[PDB]
Write an enzyme that holds these catalytic residues in place. Structure first.
Site, PDB file in Angstrom:
ATOM      1  CE  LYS A 176      -4.102  -0.539   4.668  1.00  0.00           C
ATOM      2  NZ  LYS A 176      -5.406   0.101   4.934  1.00  0.00           N
TER       3      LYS A 176
ATOM      4  CG  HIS B  61      -2.137  -0.839   1.075  1.00  0.00           C
ATOM      5  ND1 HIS B  61      -2.097  -2.211   1.221  1.00  0.00           N
ATOM      6  CD2 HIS B  61      -3.430  -0.524   0.809  1.00  0.00           C
ATOM      7  CE1 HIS B  61      -3.313  -2.704   1.040  1.00  0.00           C
ATOM      8  NE2 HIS B  61      -4.144  -1.700   0.812  1.00  0.00           N
TER       9      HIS B  61
END
Ligand SMILES: [Mg+2]
Ligand SMILES: [Mg+2]
Ligand SMILES: [Mg+2]
Ligand SMILES: [Mg+2]
Lengths: 247, 247, 247, 247
Positions: free
Chosen positions: A138, A134
């Site tokens: 995040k 990601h």
């Protein structure tokens, strides 16, 4: 005929997107656009047939009761769904059959397929690991989906031996997060959005399923599929999986 | 109590590997190893229950006839099965309804799973391509499996538009081989064995299924699987897939 | 002190982007923003020290002469650069030393590195192939970069044996485009932007370098690096590679 | 005219492989195979020019002393080289300035290239991570190579901000092992051998370097390379990298 789609949380991130998506869709007409504070009666006033609801966990139960009470089908992306929340929905549905509710944690079709594929593959391999990648903004590691996948994999491999692992010396965290005996590694990298790779292995072969969400609006085609298909199954459906019609 | 497995073509490459595998398996008993000229009655004399047959196309029909006539389940990896030969297997089976024959062109579980996944994902994506990568001693490009795979995908996507493609100017070959409107690219690279990527894409998401065979003997688990489960499906099964019990 | 950056083609796609990028940059000030038809004197009027030029092949030679005549450094992304165009630039530079011109075909740093890495790796492996992946709205296959990479690889492997390839039976295009004896496969997939993978192999090992351009504005950090570093090397530099300072 | 190569520890795993490799090489002549207790004078009696030494840490110093004293170039794969032992090799060499010793912890060319590339790319990307993947019989996580790699990358990025990372909530291990602020994740999966991915990312682009070793004997080409080229660098070389002649 236009199918009459209402959106709840229409100024929220997902709702505004869905409003746009309903507009663009030839078969869908937006029958009502409601966001926080709009009376739900606007839905029946406009003969809504199906609602997209990505509101808050604190209003969705209000919404659903009204939707089911009124025979309005519901495609629900709101989270916070306990088994006590779930049963309540089925209780409400008893009184109104021919009313279809879909509650799904994930509307990206590629993600739903992957998880399905992971489920199907799990019991056939000695080893399974999840690598999730990601963007570095995040907050949670591993992601919900990765944790959801690992747990799915763990369950599918019930009564199989654990992943073989001869590690006796390691740095901390080298082997990832252990989710029900499945290693989950979380990569956080600038340039990435949401990515997930499930790796399966047996001496002689490996199998990898990789899903890349390149947009923030990946859920769109799945929510739309859910909206289009939702009446095909009466009562409650948890997960987008069944509506994909996999044979 | 352990299954009594026999192997035909037991001195052939695959045959001998299977004998070893069956010897090595704790739940399976080798009841006969035959190759060229050994009377098939060795199988019934030794109370053989299931047979692995990877023999030549020219002998496999007679094997099957005998196997079926004798209520012996057959896991058939030998190739050369015309529609007529399938039809003939079916006829023999009519007389023997409790006998099971599995004829499959691919016993690598991961490759079979991967193809099933490709098939289940095909309809959900605008774009689909196959990349296969083999050692550089391979005569045929693309692999049988990749071709079979593209055909499956094409077949699964019938009624959807073709792969979007604005290519107007190209060097011959850039876009790969067209198998049913599905591009297949064959990579031939020292250091590789057998590898296949199926790439699906839509605006905002991609899904990739990669199968890697690191061994020439990666098919053994599937063959042992077929051997342990074949009896569950009376009659003829084509492909290992149905035996994997994919729900 | 602010370095004084002029942009030519400032309403063009790349120029407008660069204007924005210069604005945001703490060390850079935009000294002049010129697009088609603006007198170049605006550059010297504003004491421009370095210009970004991504104009047309038909004006860039006009621009460069003026830039070099006036001791204005030039970071050039415009294409169409023949050896006859190149020499002209060096001719112009004779008369004005301490004037640095950079002409580069590619300003994405990741792309420049990859190509560099491919160059370095090429001679050490038996096999080299390029797989390029792009959005399906792309007109040319393979891409310029892939073709540029393959040719680089071919040259680096001069006097090595060809890629081993035992293919004797194939569908057309299975093996990709042949660019100087290097196979180039072009994948066109919805969801993709610009991707490129160089694969190297020898029995026992493979090496893959993969570059993903996820934005349309990938060139930005490289153009900026070029702008910042351009005065360090007087005269003409072809390719961004040297300014990366690789040791 | 062909180089006369000798192998110390010739009955050891690596030793015996090298003897075979040297036997097999068309440009190299095996002039001596020694193991435990064979007098080193066998090497000079047989006019040995270069030696491969993969022997034990406890014997390698005496080997080196003799090798250097006798003007015999040494390709040293044996481990255990402390700063002191390096210093001692250097001293012996002072007396013998035309003698070359190469001491390297990694002879897999692809792994050496990959590390060099990681190093050359590190400074250009916001984010860097190492994923390594090995067979599940590996005692140590992460691999030596991956650790060495992360250290190299960290060292190359000194003065740049750390990997951006908003992780606030995590399961222990998700983010992998911290080697110098560089995450390293260790995948242990049946069917794998030795694999390493280096992932670099910035907003709008990623760069990935993947090395796959499909064999335990993928280091042989590097050792043969070291053996053919060692004499080009008088004195001690540490790591194979300088021998690759990377321009
Ligand atoms: Mg509409
Ligand atoms: Mg047995
Ligand atoms: Mg500024
Ligand atoms: Mg020789």
């Amino acid at each position: 005929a236009m199918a009459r789609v209402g959106v709840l949380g229409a100024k929220g991130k997902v709702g505004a997107t869905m409003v746009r998506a309903v507009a663009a869709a030839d078969d869908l007409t937006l029958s009502a656009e409601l966001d926080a504070g709009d009376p739900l009666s606007l839905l029946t006033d406009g003969n809504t047939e199906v609602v997209i609801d990505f509101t808050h966990p604190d209003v969705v139960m209000g919404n659903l009761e009204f939707l089911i009470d009124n025979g309005i089908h519901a495609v629900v992306g709101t989270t916070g769904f306990t088994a006590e929340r779930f049963q309540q929905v089925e209780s409400w549905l008893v009184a109104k059959p021919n009313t279809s509710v879909l509650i799904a944690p994930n509307f990206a079709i590629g993600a739903v397929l992957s998880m399905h594929f992971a489920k199907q593959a799990a019991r056939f391999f000695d080893s399974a690991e999840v690598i999730e990648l990601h963007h570095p903004h995040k907050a949670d590691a591993p992601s919900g989906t990765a944790a959801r996948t690992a747990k799915l994999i763990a369950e599918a491999r019930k009564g199989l031996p654990p992943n073989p692992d001869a590690t006796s010396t390691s740095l901390p965290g080298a082997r990832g997060a252990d989710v029900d005996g499945i290693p989950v590694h979380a990569v956080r990298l600038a340039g990435l959005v949401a990515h997930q790779e499930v790796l399966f292995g047996t001496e002689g072969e490996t199998l990898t399923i990789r899903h890349d969400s390149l947009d923030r609006t990946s859920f769109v085609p799945g929510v739309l599929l859910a909206v289009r298909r939702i009446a095909e199954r009466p009562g409650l459906t948890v997960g987008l999986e069944p509506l994909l019609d996999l044979h």
